[PDB]
Every structure is written in C-alpha cells, then in structure tokens.
Write a protein that binds this ligand. Structure first.
Ligand SMILES: *[C@](=O)([C]([C][C][C][N]C([N])=[N])[N]C(=O)[C]([N]C(=O)C(=O)C1=[C][C]=[C]C(Cl)=[C]1)[C]([C])[C])C1=N[C]=[C]S1
Length: 237
C-alpha cells in the first residue's frame, strides 16, 4: 500500500495474508474471508504454484512479525481459478481457496459480506484498500498491515487512463487523479472494502495497475459483484 497508514489491530478482520513455503516461507498475496472455509483472492497470485500444499493462510494478523514457525495457520485443500482467467490485465482475476479446516470466527477474524446485484447503483464514498504490499515501487513486504482510503472512479474515466488496455465492466478502479495512494506489489488478492450503511462489502479484489500510485493511473480491481453467481456455483458442494 502506497501512501497509507498502519491499521488498527482487528480493523480488517476479513483480511488474510497468504504465504507460500517455497523455497522458504514468505508473504505471497492478500485475501478475504468470505466463508468459514473460503478465501476470495486474485487468480494471478498462483502463478508457478503447482500445488496448494505449499500454501498457508493466516488470519487475524496485523504484523507479519506475529507469524513464526509455531504460529497456527489454515492449510489449503483446493485452489479454484476462474476458467476464463488468463492474466490480470485481461480480467477474470479471481480465485477461491478452499481451506482444509474451518475458520472459527472471532473479533480478530470474520467474513466480509459480498456485494449485491441491487447495490450496483450505489455510490461508494468510503472505500479502503489494505495489505502488506509495497510502499514504493522498490520496497519490500511491510510488517504492519497498511490501509488507505481511495475514491472509486467510473469505468469511463478509468479507460481514459489506460489506453491500449480494455477496462471491462467486470473490473472497477479506484485512485486519485494526482496519485499518491494506491495498492502495490504484494497487495494483490487483497480486498477493496467499502462501508455503506454501516456495513462493509467486498467491492473489489486488488489486481493490477501501471506502477503504483502514479498520477492518472487508478488501481484496477476485480469487480466482485460481477462474480457473485460464480462464487455461489464454486462454493456449493
Ligand atoms: C500484486 O500485489 C500486484 C498489485 C498491483 C496493484 N497495483 C496498483 N497500481 N494498484 N499485482 C501485480 O504486480 C500484477 N501486475 C501489475 O500490476 C503490472 O504492473 C501490470 C500488469 C498489466 C498491465 C500494466 Cl499497465 C501493469 C501481477 C499480474 C504480477 C502482486 N501480484 C503478484 C506479486 S505482487
């Protein structure tokens, strides 16, 4: 996260940090708890991942420092990548992680409600992007979960900032015309939370962007509401 600040512990209870143990353990991507055994994240986060056996999901984390060898984690039983996904910039950057065990909700870890189809006409004026991603285009995984408030931008406006690219209705953008605040390397898979009527909704999934926080370069996110049917279909046994 560029231009953000340290989060308060438990402030984003749905946020998880997905680690890979290969070659040695490190943070890979962000993700969101949406069900007792389901994490929603970006599909482009499993590039090179041949098995879910090397994945570890940590919930209720604020500082990466809390993660040690003796720290409990959730194993991944299955990685579900949208069948139309090819690459982030082309869209369909969405994936489900079916945990090996169930998450016991608590104030430190609880699910975020998915957007509705009747809420596609709602104007989000309180959206936040979070993660342990980069702070600069040349930094490392941040220790403390960062947060940043960023305004959504219309798709027509976003398309203007991404010539040569196709910004579809299955994507959604957020950013300041002047830049300064945005997601960055490592925030991928993270949630783009928006509070409406005292209720948080998973509006987007951090996906891509030209660089980080550059002026006239809004961050691009998977437009979750366009995948509620897919999510239902893939999560039902
Ligand atoms: C993700 O954490 C990052 C998150 C990008 C968010 N960026 C932003 N400005 N809001 N994702 C990536 O690094 C993906 N690639 C790009 O963003 C890349 O710069 C790009 C891709 C297509 C078109 C353009 Cl113009 C720029 C990803 C596809 C690698 C991470 N995901 C993996 C490691 S960090």
């Amino acid at each position: 996260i560029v231009g953000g600040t340290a989060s308060v512990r438990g402030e984003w209870p749905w946020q998880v940090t997905l680690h890979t143990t290969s070659p040695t353990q490190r943070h890979l991507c962000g993700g969101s708890i949406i069900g007792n055994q389901w994490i929603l994240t970006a599909a482009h986060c499993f590039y090179g991942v041949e098995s879910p056996k090397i994945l570890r999901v940590y919930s209720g984390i604020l500082n990466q420092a809390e993660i040690a060898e003796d720290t409990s984690f959730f194993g991944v039983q299955e990685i579900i990548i949208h069948d139309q996904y090819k690459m982030a910039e082309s869209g369909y950057d969405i994936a489900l992680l079916k945990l090996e065990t169930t998450v016991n909700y608590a104030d430190s870890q609880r699910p975020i409600s998915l957007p509705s189809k009747g809420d596609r006409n709602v104007i989000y004026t309180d959206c936040w992007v979070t993660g342990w991603g980069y702070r600069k285009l040349r930094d490392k995984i941040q220790n403390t979960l960062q947060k940043a408030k960023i305004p959504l931008v219309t798709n027509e406006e976003c398309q203007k900032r991404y010539r040569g690219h196709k910004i579809t209705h299955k994507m959604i953008c957020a950013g300041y015309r002047e830049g300064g605040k945005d997601a960055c390397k490592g925030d991928s898979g993270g949630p783009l939370s928006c509070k409406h009527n005292e209720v948080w909704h998973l509006v987007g999934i951090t996906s891509w962007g030209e660089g980080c926080a550059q002026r006239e370069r809004p961050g691009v996110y998977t437009n979750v509401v366009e995948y509620v049917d897919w999510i239902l279909e893939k999560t039902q046994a």
